[PDB]
TrEMBL record, chain D:
Domain Glucose-methanol-choline oxidoreductase C-terminal: 504-560
Residues reported to bind FAD: I15, D34, V118, G121, M122, H125, T127, C128, A129, C241, T553
Cofactor(s) needed by this chain: FAD
UniProt GO MF annotations: flavin adenine dinucleotide binding; pyranose oxidase activity
Localisation per UniProt entry: Periplasm
Organism: Trametes ochracea (White-rot fungus)
Protein name, entry field: Pyranose 2-oxidase
One cellular component term from this protein's GO annotations in UniProt: periplasmic space
Keyword Glycoprotein: no
Gene this chain is encoded by: p2o
Amino acid sequence: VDWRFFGRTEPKEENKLWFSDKITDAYNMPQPTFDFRFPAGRTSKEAEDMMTDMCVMSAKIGGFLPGSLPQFMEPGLVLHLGGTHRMGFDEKEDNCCVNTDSRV
Amino acid sequence: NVIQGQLMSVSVPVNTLVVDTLSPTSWQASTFFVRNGSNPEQDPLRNLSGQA
Amino acid sequence: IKYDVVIVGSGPIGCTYARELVGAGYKVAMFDIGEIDSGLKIGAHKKNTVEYQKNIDKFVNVIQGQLMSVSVPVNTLVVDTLSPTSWQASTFFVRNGSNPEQDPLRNLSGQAVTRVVGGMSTHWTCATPRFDREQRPLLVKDDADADDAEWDRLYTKAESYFQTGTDQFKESIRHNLVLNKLTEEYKGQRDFQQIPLAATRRSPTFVEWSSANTVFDLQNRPNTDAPEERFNLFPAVACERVVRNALNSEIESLHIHDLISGDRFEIKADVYVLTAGAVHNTQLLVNSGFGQLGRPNPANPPELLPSLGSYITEQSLVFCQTVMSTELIDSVKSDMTIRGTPGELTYSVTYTPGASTNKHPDWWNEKVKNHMMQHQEDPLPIPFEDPEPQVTTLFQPSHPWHTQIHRDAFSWGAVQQSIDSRLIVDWRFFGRTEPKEENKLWFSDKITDAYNMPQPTFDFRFPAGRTSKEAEDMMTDMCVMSAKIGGFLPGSLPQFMEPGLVLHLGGTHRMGFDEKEDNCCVNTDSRVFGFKNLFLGGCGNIPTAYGANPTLTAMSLAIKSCEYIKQNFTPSPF
Amino acid sequence: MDIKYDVVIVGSGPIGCTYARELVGAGYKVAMFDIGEIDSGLKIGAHKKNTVEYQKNIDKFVNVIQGQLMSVSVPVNTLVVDTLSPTSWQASTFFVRNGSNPEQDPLRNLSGQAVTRVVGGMSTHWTCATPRFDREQRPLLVKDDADADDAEWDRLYTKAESYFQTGTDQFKESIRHNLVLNKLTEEYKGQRDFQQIPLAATRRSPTFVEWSSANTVFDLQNRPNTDAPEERFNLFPAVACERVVRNALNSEIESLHIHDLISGDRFEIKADVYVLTAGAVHNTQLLVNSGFGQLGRPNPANPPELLPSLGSYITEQSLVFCQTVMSTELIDSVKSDMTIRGTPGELTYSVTYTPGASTNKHPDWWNEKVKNHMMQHQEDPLPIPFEDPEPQVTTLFQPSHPWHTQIHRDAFSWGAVQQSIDSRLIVDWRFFGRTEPKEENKLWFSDKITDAYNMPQPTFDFRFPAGRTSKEAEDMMTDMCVMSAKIGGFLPGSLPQFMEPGLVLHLGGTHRMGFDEKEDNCCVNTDSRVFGFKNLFLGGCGNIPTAYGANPTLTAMSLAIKSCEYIKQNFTPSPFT
Ligand SMILES: *Cc1cc2c(cc1C)nc1c(=O)[nH]c(=O)nc-1n2C[C@H](O)[C@H](O)[C@H](O)COP(=O)(O)OP(=O)(O)OCC1O[C@@H](n2cnc3c(N)ncnc32)[C@H](O)[C@@H]1O
Ligand SMILES: *Cc1cc2c(cc1C)nc1c(=O)[nH]c(=O)nc-1n2C[C@H](O)[C@H](O)[C@H](O)COP(=O)(O)OP(=O)(O)OC[C@H]1O[C@@H](n2cnc3c(N)ncnc32)[C@H](O)[C@@H]1O
Ligand SMILES: OC[C@H]1O[C@@H](O)[C@H](F)[C@@H](O)[C@@H]1O
Ligand SMILES: OC[C@H]1O[C@@H](O)[C@H](F)[C@@H](O)[C@@H]1O
Ligand SMILES: OC[C@H]1O[C@@H](O)[C@H](F)[C@@H](O)[C@@H]1O
């Protein structure tokens, strides 16, 4: 049996997806660059509580499979990225790019 | 394998693994230069390396 | 030549009998199949070199290099990319020392033995906890306070022989950092303290770890320091059999094979003591007509010691490593005022001594201050020479496992070497296993080992029931507890270790009041039933399910055994 | 411990022991310091492999080796670990941690280079291979007189061989040894010679070999003692030697500065003669820590006053390695003289040969071992006895094959899937290339970073020089592929490869020998005396100035014997008082 627990990550100004002005990707477009850490505070603390939780819960069904021990996965493998062009009611106040009709 | 065959990594930093068992006749780097599509903009310690 | 007492094995339990019986005036001979290997102090801890304590991870290699596997099943790995010119067999034939008797699925594949003078005490981690009663064999029936009093008498003497203490890591920041966070997290539910360690600190960067040498220096006697004592140690001697009289009431000699000269002799003594390890005592005994040689066969019970080799117990072992939480690291420097920026002529880091707002004592803040000022290039507040954490919460009914929160010699994956070792903490939780008849160590009537003795074979599973539920519960508890200190280190994720890797095997020649009723081989004097003059010492004697490191308990039993010996055998005149 | 000795020797390896043997035996009052400790049994400095238990479990010995090889220079680690828990403390940079050396260019390193600190040095674990260098690998000891040079080296090697108990016959009756020897001999008949690797070892019984060591050379016992009542020698383990003090004139060493690691005290020690045998890396360190050469990143705009050649022109061998799995043809030939009737196990299996038959391919001693094995072990599919010793084969360095070779079995740690293969089938191949001495190839010491013993941190600036060295390295590899194919195919997981640079542990020329300091870009003369100094001598593979492929210690040893002969003629033992 597989076990995957997915956490929530606090939206933080400093967590960024930006694009190079000299380096280009395979399609000759600006190369995506990440500046990212899981925020300290709740996100971190819930992250580790989530791990403990998977350990406690999974033990109820069986012991871990050797080779597939409880672990954090590579940041981003989960492909659940959001907030890069995020929705909000007001541009400035809700620090956002599209309104609730997703219109820029 | 189907999955892995259409996940193209978004941002791979420059690679600093030491390969020091090349044959002495083989062309060898002097530096960790920008190779094989890597992103020199990218801090390997502040990435989403698995993003694809 | 005729001795008063011969002892087989020079590990810490044989050295117990030596120290007890040499000191009481007996003419003692001691035989080890291994050789003198630790410098001039015979049988001493190998890790007592300046070079190892400056390079402590290196020590793993010393351990690995004197751990010889007991029973390796025949190998069935498929290599099908040899060149077609290369010789290849058509079967997985018996090769490379492997045991064809061994069921690969009912083994203790991590079980191993050490053949050097001082035995495994030349490499052990020196952890010496007492068993609480739940774990402990009874030495007095129906009188618990008397039992307690006897066990404390014996444990206390054993601790003086090993130099156990709980004070050697008192001034470690990592140790106190980890010890106080766990003391707080479990306020009112569990107690934590230092792992009791057989060792004496000689300086802030050097611990003199104990060993068999600590118990007894193994020098020949008489000598200038002990001119009235008589002891000879003979290394490179395989002891092979004890010879029984026809009535099976007395041992008549010890058959040895001197590996240097190649000669074979029969040594005579009044008292024969076997302290060759929980595996090898059992082997010598079976090779001597005790228990049953060969694949066990119930419809043909043995004359003597029908319980030998049965009811063996090995601990479940879980392990991980953690990388210290940001919070705890910052807490190391909570009492610090931090001016300017590291590296510039301005940077100050200060504290005020004895301030009551201060979370940590002066001695700790001072060390932190100086490390922070002297290594402004270093992003961490723990000093580089800061000794390792050594923390435990001892076995209790509500948490029936022993625990070590600490640092052992470890061989780092080099991806793991990316992580600074001041942040890494080892977690080892040790389970107790129910003694069950079907769990067995037996010896082949056909296959033999590197010394030509009957080959050891395990038939072992962790019993169903409590043993298994606790082992799983134990792993969960390590995940829950460790989480409070930091998250797991990649490459050292929570796991069960290879059965027997823990090396805490017992009950191979188990003790009890009554042979039949308690399914056992020796009584509470470690005297083999029926026999006047044969004693077994070692973890093989322990008949219970136990989580804590067994050696000190073995040592306590050995001490009592010597009391019987002293009360029943006259030393020869010198 | 006295104020003052005739001779102090830093280092208790096989080279330091050569000076002790010579000088102690000549009546000098000698002190030997070693930073490491006695840990090899009651024979002080002996080979750790000489235990019954290691020669019954010989692959376990690889852990003893690994246990006492401490890496010389580890660059700063830049592996990315990004699966830490978010709560765990995580680096912002690749900071200097776990003793790594921020001076070190990871791409110009000898990352395999390692040092050993125990009494006896690396001679407590070495492989005991002791070949002579032929002229083309050998430093000149006599200029313009090739005959005299040859005779002086023969004299010297011969004496060393006897100090080491070198021989070429301790595996003469190994089936596997001869199997491989003969195959190769036939394969290269008229092109190359094969013989047993010369090995510093005495065979005591068919299952046990007494490997030589520093202890063979000199037993490291304190003297005076019953067996040597008129000699004077004292060994002081656990003593970090840190500096030799130069006089103001740079003509004489005035004391040796030590640090008792056990008490923690620093002391100065006096002697007439000072001998540094700390190994190729630590001889240089001590010298630099003493003001020879140039502490710090090298800086050509700043040449040093003393020994400008120290820690320059260093050499280290290319090492290529694989293992083979013996060919079916060869395995079969093992039993080619056997007559085989019946089927193994049944009551009528017969395996027989005819002693002395002319049509026999193998000698009697060989066939008799084969027959007994096959008859006593019918469940075994192989003809090689269980206790057959290991092969120990070489074709020595020649101009048309300018590498050393070892076709043998060395302690090895087996991966899972290689343990699947009967070890009787396995042969190691190691070919060793010679490296041209180049000024840019440096061992230097940092002026900021310090090692575990608070000495200046070694730092390599090394590349295998383009030209002959590289060509030969690659040629060597091919020659191993080609030669090895004749015995067997490659063992998966031990495929032909170059080994990590310096793992070979044959570093030379760090303090190299020559006739003239400036003209030969060297630090010591042919008496191994440091130029300018009356009383400072160096011994070790660091003295070797040439490009060599064979294992060096015999050669270092021969140089130290010559050195001792100069000391015997120019210094005088104190009266035995
Ligand atoms: C490790 C290894 C060595 C080998 C080899 C196999 C292995 C795995 N087998 C070899 C063989 O087959 N052929 C041979 O020629 N070489 C082999 N080697 C290398 C050989 O082992 C060395 O070449 C040889 O020891 C060199 O001898 P040495 O010049 O005596 O140097 P060694 O390092 O043995 O002893 C020096 C020592 O002095 C100490 N030390 C270091 N620094 C200090 C200071 N500062 N103060 C006091 N003592 C100091 C050491 O602790 C050491 O014993
Ligand atoms: C290896 C090890 C062990 C260990 C440990 C960690 C490591 C990796 N740390 C421990 C800890 O923290 N504390 C705890 O209590 N135990 C720990 N251990 C286990 C401990 O070392 C052993 O319990 C203890 O050493 C057992 O002592 P004992 O004296 O009974 O046995 P020994 O150490 O194995 O020595 C016995 C010897 O007898 C020899 N021998 C064997 N067969 C023969 C024959 N046939 N003839 C003559 N001699 C024989 C051995 O060579 C040996 O010396
Ligand atoms: O590998 C991560 C992925 O794994 C699956 O378990 C989930 F369905 C997804 O949400 C996710 O993209
Ligand atoms: O590797 C298992 C060993 O590890 C240690 O941490 C314990 F102290 C020992 O009791 C044990 O024998
Ligand atoms: O692994 C390198 C080593 O291997 C052996 O085969 C050698 F003989 C040595 O010259 C060398 O130290």
